[PDB]
Design a protein around this ligand. Structure first.
Ligand code: HEM
Ligand code: HEM
Ligand SMILES: Cc1cc(N)nc2cc(-c3ccc(OCC4CC4)c(CN)c3)c(F)cc12
Ligand SMILES: Cc1cc(N)nc2cc(-c3ccc(OCC4CC4)c(CN)c3)c(F)cc12
Ligand SMILES: C[C@H](O)[C@H](O)[C@H]1CNc2nc(N)[nH]c(=O)c2N1
Ligand SMILES: C[C@H](O)[C@H](O)[C@H]1CNc2nc(N)[nH]c(=O)c2N1
Ligand SMILES: [Ca+2]
Ligand SMILES: [Ca+2]
Ligand SMILES: [Cl-]
Ligand SMILES: [Cl-]
Ligand SMILES: [Gd]
Ligand SMILES: [Gd]
Ligand SMILES: [Zn+2]
Lengths: 403, 403
């Protein structure tokens, strides 16, 4: 029996048959669930992964068992036998990157998974060429505020050559300066890469919203520093529709969420550098980035300014300030004409995705704790949706920092 | 072997050594995590559970391997040889009820686990004595609004004999009625028990907050309809400290969360009727019971009265209206001098509970999805706390309905 999956809002019941195809194992056992953990830490093995991926490709174009399907499998087997590896066709790379997104359990934005611009950077040969690829990516995906999902796939990992790596966790990140108190000026999430940027010659600023340079690693080559063209880096000043003092906080966020530090794995091949981007869900900026105590931690300042009773928890000042901070983010992005999605629309679109995927594949790997927004969780429909978390391939994977 | 567990706000690491003692098996496997699922899924068997609970108990009182330890062991052995079951000492029962609460992974109020009033009703027979026990419980636990945690333990299941069952999921429940447009007046959660109360004699009200009668069932006998004395059921009319129209909405809730459909398991013994009660966390009332789409679903009503823009999700009218409902709840319980805890205080206390349990016994089973509040998740410290979920015994367990 496949796991019975219930929606408690409607009473509806599904069975996730797709989970039975999970390959790489997760961290849970019958003895103890570790779903809440942030991190769950060669010829023939490659071949079965490659074979399965090719089968996935030929299923997607409704040509399984075709002459071309058989021939591509034989073709991959021949290349793996001669070289120990193989090369994706362009069409398989596009398909692979979209499947990797489709398969990402913590992604609430996967309604969009079939609308992904795949930039093939596989013949990239230096950190300078990398930077040019990344600028094109940023330019295409920003699209002057009309954001478009993109992924740029740099060359796959191969024996006898180091990896392309982007040291930054996102293409656009604000600096975080370890101030000499032990405190931090800027984004505390980014003190480490801030430290490494300076160490590599970057003259640091002193604001709370200093865009970091990129540290780009070509294979067998220490990382190289590149400054983004400031006009490629679209940013949103934060104002509140009704709280006019909010603008005086001087809050900014950037338009493009572009994760650059995960590994893309497709049919056994690994792409350590394959930055990908979409558009923000506003709770990422409003609640996590600006209200996490270990981030910009502005919750109390806004609340004091709102004249809330911060002396007692029971006034719900924290919830009140946080809601208004999320309102400001959405208002400010809509005002700047920068794509943004609120957690209500995002989670409703995800409910549509689950329904599509149940039809399409008989299931959908989903990490409930990450799909539920960080505010107002049970006000969104995904709260009441039981979800099955499992690992499919192609996949985006966390990988160690390259230092 | 021992899961590493990290707090991401603080950066503190602990290891959960207690999860190694996981008596039973949960639903997760290496292939797939089912953490988000609400329902995961004699004679010598009795002995080994009974033996190990006795061992537990005598370990906890620092009388390990001692004199009364051996005597107790041979007592249960002989008891089960004689009868097929055995009897708990009244202190073992108290210890087993407290441990079962302490072990309940989804309970955020466990900082209180050592302060529980245990009412031994193991000498009960007929539903009329059940009703008196229950009413004493309600009366003792309400305590005119200064709520005190308590459990009443009715006779254990035994071979040959039926069971004591409280058909109601809770001692205090508002009716739910259907009409010729399919909707529900009152609490949609209780449409089933409302039909049963109606069928088994109860003449129904027609209000949104009609307190249901108690369907109490004696062994083998049908269940008898009992009405709770109105003066026993302390209710809180809901009003808002600054929104004067909120009171006119007619919202109310009851003081005593008293769950009456779970099965208490102690040392191989099973108590299919053992109602327990604490006090409410305000989000259980304001967010889940009043705002769930399948409960009272009042969010849009409140938002309309707050003159919010309800035709776009991005104004966050759901979030603003949810918070004010929770404020109303907190204000109304405080003003009425009824024990209530807000999700900030409650989650701050569970953090303390995690820290005490780390030192008391190596860990603490916790179900992140249920510990994290349904509003303002990441504003609470439990959000950033990794957790391990496993089943210890003694335990509270769900059980099939008596029908
Ligand atoms: C199009 C708009 C998108 C939205 C609104 C969105 C939203 C999100 C959110 C809210 C998270 C959780 C992050 C956190 O809470 O810190 C996430 C995770 C993630 N997203 Fe998306 N995303 C989008 C596009 C994409 C794209 C284009 C890709 C890749 C092609 C992607 C892949 C991922 C991955 C790999 C993760 C985390 C790892 C995992 O899923 O287990 N997302 N996304
Ligand atoms: C004293 C104040 C208490 C508070 C504030 C509290 C809070 C909560 C909350 C918020 C839940 C989650 C249920 C939901 O949100 O739907 C829960 C579940 C639960 N509570 Fe507590 N509770 C308290 C007392 C108690 C007591 C006295 C007992 C038993 C002696 C208990 C045992 C349980 C159990 C068994 C569950 C379900 C856990 C599971 O299914 O694994 N709690 N509690
Ligand atoms: C394309 C995209 C769009 C968006 N709107 N959002 C996104 C968020 C993440 C993301 C994934 C994991 C994360 O956390 C890493 C945990 C430590 C392992 C975070 C930061 N919380 C963000 C991501 F990859 C991609 C995103
Ligand atoms: C003593 C106590 C206090 C409190 N303050 N709260 C409590 C909540 C529950 C509880 C357990 C499981 C639940 O789940 C029901 C599944 C659908 C059948 C729910 C409702 N969500 C509540 C409970 F037992 C006891 C509680
Ligand atoms: C400890 C906990 O797992 C951790 O803070 C997670 C929980 N759920 C999350 N969910 C999302 N979407 N994003 C996050 O960063 C987190 N953080
Ligand atoms: C699907 C999911 O498991 C379900 O909605 C859970 C999630 N977390 C919860 N958390 C609490 N405290 N109470 C609940 O009823 C639930 N419901
Ligand atoms: Ca070739
Ligand atoms: Ca009709
Ligand atoms: Cl971000
Ligand atoms: Cl309740
Ligand atoms: Gd104003
Ligand atoms: Gd009005
Ligand atoms: Zn799990």
């Amino acid at each position: 029996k496949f796991p019975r999956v219930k929606n408690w809002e409607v009473g509806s019941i599904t069975y996730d048959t797709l989970s039975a195809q999970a390959q790489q194992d997760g961290p849970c056992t019958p003895r103890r669930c570790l779903g809440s953990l942030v991190f769950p830490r060669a010829p023939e093995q490659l071949l079965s992964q490659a074979r399965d991926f090719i089968n996935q490709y030929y299923s997607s174009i409704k040509r399984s068992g075709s002459q071309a399907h058989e021939q591509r499998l034989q073709e991959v087997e021949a290349e793996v036998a001669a070289t120990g590896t193989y090369q994706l066709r362009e069409s398989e790379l596009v398909f692979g990157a979209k499947q990797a997104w489709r398969n990402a359990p913590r992604c609430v934005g996967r309604i969009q998974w079939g609308k992904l611009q795949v930039f093939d950077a596989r013949d990239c040969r230096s950190a300078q060429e990398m930077f040019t690829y990344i600028c094109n990516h940023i330019k295409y995906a920003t699209n002057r505020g009309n954001l478009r999902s993109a992924i740029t796939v740099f060359p796959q990992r191969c024996p006898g050559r180091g990896d392309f790596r982007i040291w930054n966790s996102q293409l656009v990140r604000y600096a975080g300066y370890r101030q000499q108190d032990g405190s931090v000026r800027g984004d505390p999430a980014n003190v480490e890469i801030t430290e490494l940027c300076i160490q590599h010659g970057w003259t640091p600023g002193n604001g709370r919203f200093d865009v970091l340079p990129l540290l780009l690693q070509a294979p067998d080559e220490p990382p190289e520093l590149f400054l983004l063209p400031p006009e490629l880096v679209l940013e949103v000043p934060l104002e509140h529709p009704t709280l006019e003092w909010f603008a005086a906080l001087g809050l900014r966020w950037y338009a493009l969420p572009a994760v650059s530090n995960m590994l893309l794995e497709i049919g056994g091949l690994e792409f350590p550098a394959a930055p990908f981007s979409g558009w923000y869900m506003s709770t990422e900026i409003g609640t996590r980035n600006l209200c996490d105590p270990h981030r910009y931690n502005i919750l109390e300042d806004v609340a004091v300014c709102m004249d809330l009773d911060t002396r007692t928890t029971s006034s719900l000042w924290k919830d009140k300030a946080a809601v208004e901070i999320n309102v400001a983010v959405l208002h400010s992005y809509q005002l700047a004409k920068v794509t943004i999605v609120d957690h209500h629309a995002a989670t409703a679109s995800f409910m549509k995705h689950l329904e599509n995927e149940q039809k399409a594949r008989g299931g959908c790997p989903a990490d409930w704790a990450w799909i539920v927004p960080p505010i107002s969780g049970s006000l969104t429909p995904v709260f009441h949706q039981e979800m099955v978390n499992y690992f499919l391939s192609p996949a985006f994977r966390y990988q160690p920092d390259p230092w």
